[PDB]
Amino acid sequence: MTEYKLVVVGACGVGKSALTIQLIQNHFVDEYDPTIEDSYRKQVVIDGETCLLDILDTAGRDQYMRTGEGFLCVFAINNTKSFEDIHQYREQIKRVKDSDDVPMVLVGNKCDLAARTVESRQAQDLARSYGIPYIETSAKTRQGVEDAFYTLVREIRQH
Ligand SMILES: Nc1nc2c(ncn2[C@@H]2O[C@H](COP(=O)(O)OP(=O)(O)O)[C@@H](O)[C@H]2O)c(=O)[nH]1
Ligand SMILES: [Ca+2]
Numbered sequence: 266m267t268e269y270k271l272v273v274v275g276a277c278g279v280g281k282s283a284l285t286i287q288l289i290q291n292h293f294v295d296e297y298d299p300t301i302e303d304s305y306r307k308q309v310v311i312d313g314e315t316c317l318l319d320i321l322d323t324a325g326r327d328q329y330m331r332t333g334e335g336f337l338c339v340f341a342i343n344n345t346k347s348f349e350d351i352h353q354y355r356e357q358i359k360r361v362k363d364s365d366d367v368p369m370v371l372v373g374n375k376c377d378l379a380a381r382t383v384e385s386r387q388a389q390d391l392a393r394s395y396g397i398p399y400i401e402t403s404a405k406t407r408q409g410v411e412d413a414f415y416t417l418v419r420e421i422r423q424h
């Protein structure tokens with residue numbers, strides 16, 4: 266059975282854990298320990314293929330960075346600093362992968378919140394500059410969550 270090794274990165278508080286737990290448990294967590302870093306497993310069918318997702322939810326390991334097959338680079342659309350921080354996460358990934366061609370999806374999380382300070386078009390443009398997709402999500406409503414993870418799988422498959 267095929268396994269896809271995924272790594273979720275981004276600034277503290279953007280919703281890395283909430284996204285991961287929403288995908289695994291179908292539940293929105295309101296106060297998950299910001300320091301807990303662990304890997305989670307889920308069997309899913311994607312485009313007719315039964316596969317295993319092996320997901321590291323990082324909390325700011327070396328093994329997953331080195332052997333991770335794709336990365337969700339997450340910021341929150343109500344957190345300008347987190348968006349600005351994305352560049353540094355992608356630079357770290359390029360250094361470990363020794364490549365500028367790494368399966369990756371840019372995720373703008375917390376799209377349910379009204380205090381938007383990063384416009385969709387800003388993030389689209391960032392993603393275009395990296396040659397990667399941009400997807401908006403809400404870990405709270407579940408909007409876009411499966412799409413983000415499954416798109417990452419589809420990006421790994423093109424690699
Ligand atoms: N409204 C809203 N809050 C969110 C969302 N995702 C995460 N949060 C909240 O943001 C805070 C940080 O989430 P968390 O998963 O711990 O972030 P992490 O540090 O990236 O793992 C928590 O209070 C979450 O409940 C979302 O999509 N919408
Ligand atoms: Ca290197």
Ligand SMILES: [Ca+2]
Nearest residue numbers: 360361362363
């Ligand atoms: Ca390397």
Ligand SMILES: [Mg+2]
Nearest residue numbers: 281282299324
């Ligand atoms: Mg966390």
Ligand code: NA
Nearest residue numbers: 345382383384
């Ligand atoms: Na602005």
Ligand code: NA
Nearest residue numbers: 366395396397
């Ligand atoms: Na690309």
